[PDB]
Structures are given as C-alpha cells and as structure tokens.
Design a protein around this ligand. Structure first.
Ligand SMILES: Nc1ncnc2c1ncn2[C@@H]1O[C@H](COP(=O)(O)OP(=O)(O)O)[C@@H](O)[C@H]1O
Ligand SMILES: Nc1ncnc2c1ncn2[C@@H]1O[C@H](CO)[C@@H](O)[C@H]1O
Ligand SMILES: [Mg+2]
Lengths: 418, 324
C-alpha cells in the first residue's frame, strides 16, 4: 500500500536524489526536535540555527499546520524555544484525532514575496500521474510518457512569470523523474519558492508505494513510515510487520485501543474488515482493540507467533467485564485451517493462565480446508484449560459470533462444531 | 470493457508456478463438473527442467507437462487461452508481460500480492491494448461453475459440492475479497439457484479488471439474471455502477454492499489488509458508496448481516415474474 513519509524523509530523499539545473537552496538545512532533544548537541550539529531566523513546525503527518497555529515563522532560536514551550510534548487534537506533539522540524526562514510562491503536486491514478501547477494548470502524464521541461512550459507554465519559466520547468521535470525513480504515489510542495537566489522547498508532503522496497531500498535506505497522527507505533506492530515481510503469507496488526476489551484474530482481508464493521455496527467501537488479519496459508508456527502477540497484548491489564476474543473467518479457499488453528490452540495453551485471569471469552467461526479438525482442537483446548470457548462452523453466519459475544443474541449450542 | 465471456467448459490453461495442490483442486472441480478434459494443459516452472507431474482425474493418475520455458508450453499447447500466474511478487511483472507476447492468451489471472502499483499500471496498459482480461493482482481468482475455476478458488471438493459449484445457477458476482467470495458462494447457494460465475478482482489499488468490467459482462450474459457486488472502502470504482444504471446500460437487478463502514467511526485513518482499502477522500468510504448505490437503484442491505436476505428477496421476485 501507499504510505506517507515525514516531511524530513521526503526532503532528505529529494535533496539527495533530484536532478535539476535549478539552484536548490538550503539543502539538508533542517533540524529535528523532540521532548528528549539535547539542545546543546543540536546546536553543535546545526550551527546554522544561529545564522538567520527560523521556522518551526511539527512533522507528524498533520495537514494545514499554518491554519492550526502550528507553524512558527521568522523566529530567532530563542523565539523557537519559546514557541515550543506550550506545544512540545503537549496533547493536541487535530480534526478528531488526539495525540502528542513530539516531533518538530526547524528550518531557515526564507524571506520572499507572495508572487514568489508556487504550488506543485504530482499524484498517481490508474491512467497515469497528474502534475499540478499553480502560481491552476493540470496535466495527465500517461504511463509510458516522459515529462520534459518543454512539455511543462507548454502545458503548465502558461501563466507563470516569464523570468521564472526556465527554472520552474527544469525543477518540475527533475521532480517528476525523482517521483518516478523512487516510486512515489503522491508528492506535494506547497509552497515552492523561487527568488533571485534560487529554489526553496518550503513544505513537502508525500506518499511512497511501500511494496517497492525490493526495488528502491538502495535509495530509500532505512525509510520510516510514520503512523497517522492520533495513533502510536507499537513494538508488536513492528514484530508482526517483520513476520509479514518474511513469507508470502499476509500477517497484519494495527492497534486501535490497547485497553479495549474486544480483540479479534480473523483470517482474510475482507472478513477481518466485515467483523470490524459488525463490531462497530453493534456499539463496540470504543472497546475494539485492534484491526488485523492473517491470510495466505500461514504455517502453524507463523500463526502461533501471530496469536501469542495478541494474547500477550490482551492480558496486560484486567478489565471489570473481562474480555472477548473473536477468532473468525470466511470459508477459506486454501488456508489449512487445522494447521493454523493448531498454532492458535498452542498459543492459547501457553497463555491459559493469564487468559483466565483477564476473564477472556473466545468465539470461533471458520470454514475452509480441514476445518472440522480445526474446530475440534479449539473445542478441546477450551475443556483442557477451563477457558470458555464457543465453536461454530459453516452452518453459522460468519458474523453471528459478534452478536453472541456482545450479548445482542443468545448462544446456539445446537450449532456447535457445524 | 473487453470480452463478455472469459471461460467455458472447454477452457484450457497454463499455470505459471509449481502449484500442484492448486492444479489438483482445479482437476477435482473439472471432474464433478463433467468436463471432457482437465482445465490445466501444462505448467511453466523455470526452476526445474521439463518434466511431467502426476495428477488425478477422478481415480485415474494422469500426467501434465511442466515446462522450463514458457515458449515451449505455448507452442505445444495452442488450445490454451488462459494463464494463471502464481509467480512471486518479484517476478510477476516480467512473467505477465511475457505472457502477453502470446496472442493466444486472452485472460490472465495474477495471484501475487505486493506488486507495486506502478508496475501494475503498465500491465494494465499493455493488457488494454491487446484486449487481454487481467484478473488480479492480489486475488484468489474466480469460478465459473460447470466450466472453469482459477487456482484455489472455491477450495476443496467438499466445499465445491456443498455450495453447488459444479453447475451454474442464475446469480453472478464480483468481489474485491478472495475469502469473502467463498462466503458469497455459500450465501448465494443457500438463497438462490446458485452461482453462474464469480470473480474476485483482488484488493490492489488498480485491479487489472474492475467491478464494472465484470458487471458489464454479466449484464450481457443471458444465463445471468441478477448480479451481486461486494465492494470495499477505497477508490471510486463502485460509482461506475450507479452511472451504468442511470444510463440504462445496467438493467438486471444488482445487489451491492461495500465493506469498511467501520473506518467512518475511527478517529484516524486505518489502512486495512488489502492494498487499495484506504479512503483518500470522503467519497471513497464504504458509507458514501453504499448510500450512492442505494439512491441509484441498487439493492443495498442495512449491513453485511442482511445481505443474504436481500439476495433471496430479489431472487424470488425474479422467479415470480418469469425471468428465472
Ligand atoms: N522556511 C520558510 N520560510 C518562509 N516562510 C515559510 C517557511 N515555511 C513556511 N513558510 C510560510 O508558512 C506557511 C505555512 O507553512 P507550511 O509548511 O506550508 O505548512 P502547512 O501547509 O501545513 O500550513 C507557508 O505556506 C509559507 O507561507
Ligand atoms: N541533538 C540531539 N539530542 C538528542 N539525541 C540526539 C541528538 N543528536 C542525535 N541524537 C540521537 O542519537 C542517535 C544517533 O547516535 C539517534 O537516535 C538520535 O536521535
Ligand atoms: Mg504547505
């Protein structure tokens, strides 16, 4: 999938890899600040922070920072530190997401006029990449088409100041080659500034196609994909992500609410979303802990390692009303249900102690290859461990176990194992 | 789009990859469908030399040739017009481009997940120019009961039998999800005379063939009397259905539900399991798509839980008036 990168990451790549005749200024002149920053050390590494005034803004995938009061413009270093005091490390709500302001970029202030500000954006669609320019012109660049400076002058720069067309065209042609070479899917510079001294990339927002790592990793390096603002990143997510990378099997985990009492471990992209849909249609969105799925015929050991991560995460703190684990799925096409459920059963066994302490109740529904033995060993571990487990097969509507687990409907023992 | 009909009970395929279980599963389905011949004429696997692989046609062991070179497989099997590509993500692009140098191939299924979007767009461009239908990437494939099934679609024989996938009914469907298309097999078989044809277009941002590509095929297929679409958050592909109805191009009843309505209730954006399953603007959400489909005249249930009920209701009205 296409993943956002920080402004800092995107500018680093652009400064390193763009090829343009245009004189790009302030290359690599940025400094990153967090609540843990050693400001003496920062100033050792970035002495230019004293050379001219500054701009400071969070770099956490927050849009429209200027409209939110979150860009400090034309400040001395002392003015930056004062501007950060009420913000750095504070909770903030942007739109409907809430998180901590904890990652800021400082850059040189660039004096310029309104007429020296430009907008450029490139974004991917099925039919090609659209290139947008505004001082609004937009050009579809087809899948096999080149974008040369003369093309940009003819189709995009008709309204641009005459003295800036050559440098704008060279930059945008370079930008587009960079966008393609590094497998971007979205790249916006708002504003791009061009003065008598050259080109300045004042702002940058971007997404890369993360599946292109096997092609791009020499240029990308150890690229980071930050979570959206309002979510944290967790080591378990990184652990699952590492599993997902090592096999053709798909293993995904996104923590929504680590303290929620409703956990899922569903097979399949589609079904995992339908279960989540059904949980929220039934009131449990504030108690839904996670979204994720496993699919693509993982082994018993991959499914054990996946499941033990979940069971660990849902036995971190108790809940007055205990917890629910939804082990669900469609009728699989090829996943060995017995082999995967044996992985899960072994995880359940290893964690049976903590699982009882947190009053976890388990609901299971699944079809596919070998599923009858899959459902049996689930029923079996329930009796061995004392954990309550209610086990259903193809004869149960896929999502019925959600209503069961939230009390909207009763448990039909007449369908167990069917 | 392109061809209305992709498969028949005479379809022959080449399978790219050493996927003996998938191939045997196809042959098990071929047998209970009463096909004359196995649907897999040959396999291509560059990591071994030419050899023959043992398979079973009912109880009889038979041999299917495995070729190191695609050129040999194509030349020895001119009857083949379908290629099912199980190549890993790293080589799916090159092997699919290579397949499209053979004019005999009119349909390609691309199984692998994780192909870069920019490579898929180039496959789509070559495919559109040649008239080739691509199903995938990132898909299990599809199934045409009585005729042909792609790879692992529909699972083992016991599932093929339980969901009556050995002979066609009157209901066609298209879905983004592979797993959920086997759930649709189940639902449709319990509420109607069964599946006529189903396709899983895969979960990527740019599917080789879109919902509307297949819905148009079904509209133009006389055996199809009604159509079921399982949509998903992300992109705007489903609005082409509203347009087709509005234009009078789509006249058969259409039932649709888009998954991903939970995203509207989260305080932040969530990338779901399928690569394309992420809304970049308000109209790409499941809730917006479902509401627009409903206003255009599609039969939309309140939630996935009522999908079987509305399918059965549409099916029964069509029997009542003599259409089925
Ligand atoms: N380095 C800079 N020098 C001068 N002005 C700047 C600089 N960075 C930002 N600005 C001004 O502040 C505005 C808001 O900053 P920006 O990074 O574009 O954030 P956002 O687009 O999220 O509001 C810019 O549009 C520009 O007018
Ligand atoms: N100015 C600084 N203040 C605090 N930590 C720093 C500073 N410069 C580098 N580091 C940290 O040191 C590590 C590299 O040696 C990185 O993790 C980086 O975050
Ligand atoms: Mg901006």
């Amino acid at each position: 999938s296409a993943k956002a990168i920080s402004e800092q990451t995107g500018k680093e790549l652009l400064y390193k890899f763009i090829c343009t005749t245009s004189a790009i200024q302030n290359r690599f002149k940025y400094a990153r600040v967090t609540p843990d920053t050693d400001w003496a050390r920062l100033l050792q590494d970035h002495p230019w922070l004293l050379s001219q005034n500054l701009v400071v803004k969070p770099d956490q995938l927050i849009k429209r920072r200027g409209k939110l009061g979150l860009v400090g413009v034309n400040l001395t270093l002392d003015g930056v530190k004062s501007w950060l005091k009420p913000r750095l490390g504070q909770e903030a709500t942007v739109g409907k997401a809430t998180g901590f302001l904890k990652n800021f970029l400082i850059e040189p202030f660039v004096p310029h006029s309104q007429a020296e500000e430009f907008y450029v954006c490139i974004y991917a669609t099925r039919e090609g990449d659209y290139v947008l320019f505004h001082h609004a012109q937009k050009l579809l660049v087809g899948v096999d088409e080149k974008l040369n400076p003369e093309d940009i002058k003819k189709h995009l720069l008709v309204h641009a100041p005459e003295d800036k067309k050559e440098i704008l065209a060279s930059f945008i042609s370079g930008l587009f080659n960079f966008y393609e070479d590094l497998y971007f899917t979205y790249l916006e510079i708002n504003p791009l500034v061009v003065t008598k001294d050259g080109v300045y990339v004042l702002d940058l927002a971007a997404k890369v196609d993360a599946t292109a790592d096997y092609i791009c990793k020499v240029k990308w390096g150890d690229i980071e994909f930050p979570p959206p603002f309002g979510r944290e990143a967790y080591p378990e997510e990184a652990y699952i992500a590492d599993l997902d990378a090592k096999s053709g099997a798909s293993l995904k985990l996104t923590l929504l609410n680590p303290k929620g009492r409703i956990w899922t471990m569903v097979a399949g992209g589609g079904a995992s979303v339908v279960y989540s849909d059904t949980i929220c249609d039934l009131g449990g969105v504030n108690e839904l802990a996670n979204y994720g799925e496993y699919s693509g015929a993982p082994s018993e050991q991959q499914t054990y390692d996946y499941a033990k991560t979940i069971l660990s995460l849902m036995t971190r703190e108790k809940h007055p009303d205990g917890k629910i684990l939804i082990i669900g799925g469609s009728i699989a096409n090829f996943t060995n249900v017995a082999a995967t459920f044996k992985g899960i059963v072994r995880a359940i066994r290893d964690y049976q102690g903590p699982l009882k302490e947190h009053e976890v109740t388990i609901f299971v529904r699944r079809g596919g290859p070998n599923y009858q033995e899959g459902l049996r060993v689930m029923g079996e571990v329930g009796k061995t461990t004392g954990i309550p487990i209610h086990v259903f097969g193809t004869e149960t509507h896929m999502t019925a176990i959600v209503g069961m687990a939230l009390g909207h409907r009763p448990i039909p023992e007449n369908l167990y194992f069917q | 789009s392109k061809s209305t009909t992709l498969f028949s009970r005479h379809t022959k395929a080449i399978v790219w990859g050493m996927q003996t279980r998938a191939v045997q599963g196809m042959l098990d389905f071929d047998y209970v469908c009463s096909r004359d011949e196995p649907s897999v004429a040959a396999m291509v696997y560059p990591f071994t030399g030419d050899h023959k692989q043992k398979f079973y046609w009912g109880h009889k062991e038979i041999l299917i040739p495995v070729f190191k070179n695609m050129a040999d497989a194509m030349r020895k099997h001119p009857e083949v017009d379908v290629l099912i590509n199980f190549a890993s993500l790293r080589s799916a692009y090159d092997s699919t481009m290579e397949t499209m140098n053979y004019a005999q191939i009119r349909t390609i299924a691309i199984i692998a997940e994780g192909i870069p979007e920019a490579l898929t767009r180039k496959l789509i461009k070559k495919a559109d120019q040649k008239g080739v239908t691509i199903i995938g990437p990132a898909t299990v494939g599809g199934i045409k009961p009585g005729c042909f099934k792609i790879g692992n679609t529909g699972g083992m024989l016991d599932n093929i039998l339980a969901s009556k996938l050995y002979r066609p009914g009157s209901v066609a469907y298209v879905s983004r999800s592979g797993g959920m298309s086997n759930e649709l097999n189940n639902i449709i078989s319990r509420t109607t005379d069964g599946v006529y044809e189903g396709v899983a277009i895969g979960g990527d941002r740019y599917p080789g063939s879109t919902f509307m590509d297949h819905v148009l095929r079904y509209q133009d297929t006389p055996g199809v009397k009604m159509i079921v679409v399982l949509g998903e958050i992300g992109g705007t592909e489903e609005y082409k259905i509203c347009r087709g109805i509005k234009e009078g191009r789509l006249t058969k009843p259409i039932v649709c539900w888009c998954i991903g309505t939970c995203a509207t209730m989260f305080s932040s954006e969530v990338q779901f399991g399928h690569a394309g399953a992420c809304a970049n603007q308000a109209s790409e959400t499941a809730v917006a798509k479902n509401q627009a489909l409903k206003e255009a005249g599609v039969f939309v249930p309140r939630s996935f839980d009522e999908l079987g009920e509305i399918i059965q209701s549409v099916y029964e009205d069509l029997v009542a008036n003599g259409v089925i």
